[PDB]
Design a protein around this ligand. Structure first.
Ligand code: 3OT
Length: 124
């Protein structure tokens, strides 16, 4: 019942290393990945194992940090904005599916505050 995970390899498009992409992997992803609340966000939502009714009927653009980490490690992103959009999608999905006060929402909000603190120091 789960869909295949988001693509993470980039076989047909060009690749580049930029200072912003370096910061996104070394600082932003690394800081959130090591956070105590990271585990639920480290791989695609398994709606079957988690018993999440209608998850993939409600969430049509799933995203997670395991995918973002692999995308950065595989040079899937050409522009830093593509990666920032993926983090935003991951948080937004959680807020859409869940309710205020749910444990997962409080965890996502703490991770998003940390994301915003780090994104404030994104370079040029
Ligand atoms: C990201 O969005 C959501 C996430 C989750 C979610 C909550 C807890 C989660 C998780 C996802 N993924 C994991 C870790 C991976 C996992 C998944 C399946 C069973 C076991 C581990 N865990 C920890 C499980 N815990 C610890 C080990 O004892 C079992 C209980 C729930 C709801 C809505 C969402 O929108």
């Amino acid at each position: 019942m789960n869909p295949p995970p988001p693509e993470t390899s980039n076989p047909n498009k060009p690749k580049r290393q930029t200072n912003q992409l370096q910061y996104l992997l070394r600082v932003v992803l690394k800081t959130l990945w090591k956070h105590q609340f990271a585990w639920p966000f480290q791989q695609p939502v398994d709606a079957v194992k988690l018993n999440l009714p209608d998850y993939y009927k409600i969430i049509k653009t799933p995203m997670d940090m395991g995918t973002i980490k692999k995308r950065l490690e595989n040079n899937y992103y050409w522009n830093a904005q593509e990666c920032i959009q993926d983090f935003n999608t991951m948080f937004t999905n959680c807020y859409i599916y869940n309710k205020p006060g749910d444990d997962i929402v409080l965890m996502a909000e703490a991770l998003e505050k940390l994301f915003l603190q780090k994104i404030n120091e994104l370079p040029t």
